[PDB]
Amino acid sequence: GSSGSSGRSKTVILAKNLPAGTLAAEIQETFSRFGSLGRVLLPEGGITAIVEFLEPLEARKAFRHLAYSKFHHVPLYLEWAPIGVFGAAPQKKDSQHEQPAEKAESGPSSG
Numbered sequence: 001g002s003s004g005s006s007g008r009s010k011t012v013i014l015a016k017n018l019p020a021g022t023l024a025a026e027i028q029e030t031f032s033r034f035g036s037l038g039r040v041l042l043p044e045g046g047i048t049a050i051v052e053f054l055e056p057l058e059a060r061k062a063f064r065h066l067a068y069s070k071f072h073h074v075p076l077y078l079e080w081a082p083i084g085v086f087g088a089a090p091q092k093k094d095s096q097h098e099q100p101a102e103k104a105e106s107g108p109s110s111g
Contacts, residue, residue, distance in 0.1 A: 003083040010056045011038075012081035013063060017074045018047040027051060030071070034062040050081065 053059030
Protein backbone atom coordinates (compact mmCIF):
# COMPACT_ATOMS: atom_id res chain seq x y z
CA GLY A 1 0.00 0.00 0.00
CA SER A 2 2.81 2.40 -0.86
CA SER A 3 2.33 2.98 -4.59
CA GLY A 4 -1.33 3.81 -4.05
CA SER A 5 -0.20 7.16 -2.68
CA SER A 6 0.55 8.22 -6.26
CA GLY A 7 -2.21 6.34 -8.06
CA ARG A 8 -0.56 4.12 -10.66
CA SER A 9 2.76 2.43 -11.41
CA LYS A 10 5.50 4.69 -12.78
CA THR A 11 8.02 1.95 -13.56
CA VAL A 12 5.67 -0.59 -15.14
CA ILE A 13 4.00 0.32 -18.42
CA LEU A 14 1.67 -1.63 -20.71
CA ALA A 15 1.40 -1.63 -24.51
CA LYS A 16 -1.88 -1.92 -26.42
CA ASN A 17 -2.65 -2.21 -30.13
CA LEU A 18 0.03 -4.78 -30.95
CA PRO A 19 0.05 -6.97 -34.09
CA ALA A 20 -0.17 -10.75 -33.70
CA GLY A 21 3.30 -10.69 -35.22
CA THR A 22 4.83 -8.91 -32.24
CA LEU A 23 6.85 -11.02 -29.80
CA ALA A 24 7.96 -10.76 -26.17
CA ALA A 25 11.63 -10.47 -27.12
CA GLU A 26 10.89 -7.87 -29.80
CA ILE A 27 9.20 -5.66 -27.21
CA GLN A 28 11.87 -6.20 -24.56
CA GLU A 29 14.64 -5.06 -26.90
CA THR A 30 12.66 -2.29 -28.60
CA PHE A 31 12.35 -0.74 -25.14
CA SER A 32 15.79 -1.80 -23.90
CA ARG A 33 17.04 0.59 -26.58
CA PHE A 34 16.26 3.51 -24.28
CA GLY A 35 17.41 1.87 -21.06
CA SER A 36 17.84 -1.37 -19.12
CA LEU A 37 14.64 -3.29 -18.38
CA GLY A 38 13.56 -5.40 -15.43
CA ARG A 39 10.64 -7.67 -16.29
CA VAL A 40 8.79 -8.43 -19.53
CA LEU A 41 5.53 -10.36 -19.91
CA LEU A 42 3.66 -10.54 -23.22
CA PRO A 43 0.89 -13.16 -23.51
CA GLU A 44 -0.09 -14.55 -26.91
CA GLY A 45 -3.81 -14.63 -26.19
CA GLY A 46 -3.71 -10.91 -25.50
CA ILE A 47 -1.77 -8.65 -27.85
CA THR A 48 -1.25 -6.37 -24.85
CA ALA A 49 2.30 -6.50 -23.51
CA ILE A 50 3.60 -5.68 -20.03
CA VAL A 51 7.07 -4.18 -19.59
CA GLU A 52 8.63 -3.21 -16.26
CA PHE A 53 11.40 -0.61 -16.04
CA LEU A 54 14.24 -0.75 -13.52
CA GLU A 55 14.18 3.04 -13.32
CA PRO A 56 11.18 5.41 -13.09
CA LEU A 57 12.98 8.26 -14.86
CA GLU A 58 13.89 6.13 -17.88
CA ALA A 59 10.42 4.57 -18.02
CA ARG A 60 8.77 7.98 -18.36
CA LYS A 61 11.33 9.07 -20.96
CA ALA A 62 10.33 6.18 -23.23
CA PHE A 63 6.63 6.64 -22.47
CA ARG A 64 6.50 10.11 -24.04
CA HIS A 65 9.02 9.13 -26.71
CA LEU A 66 7.38 5.94 -27.98
CA ALA A 67 3.98 7.50 -27.31
CA TYR A 68 2.28 8.70 -30.49
CA SER A 69 4.37 6.22 -32.48
CA LYS A 70 3.61 3.09 -34.49
CA PHE A 71 5.39 -0.20 -33.84
CA HIS A 72 4.91 -2.14 -37.08
CA HIS A 73 1.68 -1.22 -38.87
CA VAL A 74 -0.51 -0.16 -35.95
CA PRO A 75 -0.11 2.73 -33.47
CA LEU A 76 1.38 1.82 -30.10
CA TYR A 77 -0.82 2.73 -27.13
CA LEU A 78 1.13 2.90 -23.87
CA GLU A 79 -0.94 2.61 -20.69
CA TRP A 80 0.45 2.97 -17.17
CA ALA A 81 0.17 -0.19 -15.07
CA PRO A 82 -2.08 -0.26 -11.98
CA ILE A 83 -0.66 -0.49 -8.46
CA GLY A 84 -2.41 -3.84 -8.16
CA VAL A 85 -0.97 -5.13 -11.42
CA PHE A 86 1.61 -7.05 -9.39
CA GLY A 87 -0.24 -7.09 -6.08
CA ALA A 88 1.10 -7.32 -2.53
CA ALA A 89 2.69 -10.03 -0.39
CA PRO A 90 2.31 -10.84 3.33
CA GLN A 91 4.81 -9.65 5.92
CA LYS A 92 6.38 -11.16 9.04
CA LYS A 93 3.65 -9.83 11.34
CA ASP A 94 1.29 -12.18 9.50
CA SER A 95 2.91 -15.08 11.34
CA GLN A 96 1.83 -13.51 14.64
CA HIS A 97 -1.78 -14.15 13.59
CA GLU A 98 -1.15 -17.82 14.36
CA GLN A 99 -2.33 -18.99 17.78
CA PRO A 100 -0.49 -20.99 20.47
CA ALA A 101 -1.25 -24.55 21.56
CA GLU A 102 -1.82 -23.79 25.24
CA LYS A 103 -5.10 -22.07 24.37
CA ALA A 104 -6.29 -25.64 23.85
CA GLU A 105 -6.64 -26.07 27.61
CA SER A 106 -9.20 -23.26 27.72
CA GLY A 107 -12.55 -24.96 28.23
CA PRO A 108 -16.05 -24.68 29.75
CA SER A 109 -17.00 -25.27 33.38
CA SER A 110 -19.73 -27.89 33.03
CA GLY A 111 -22.06 -29.52 30.52
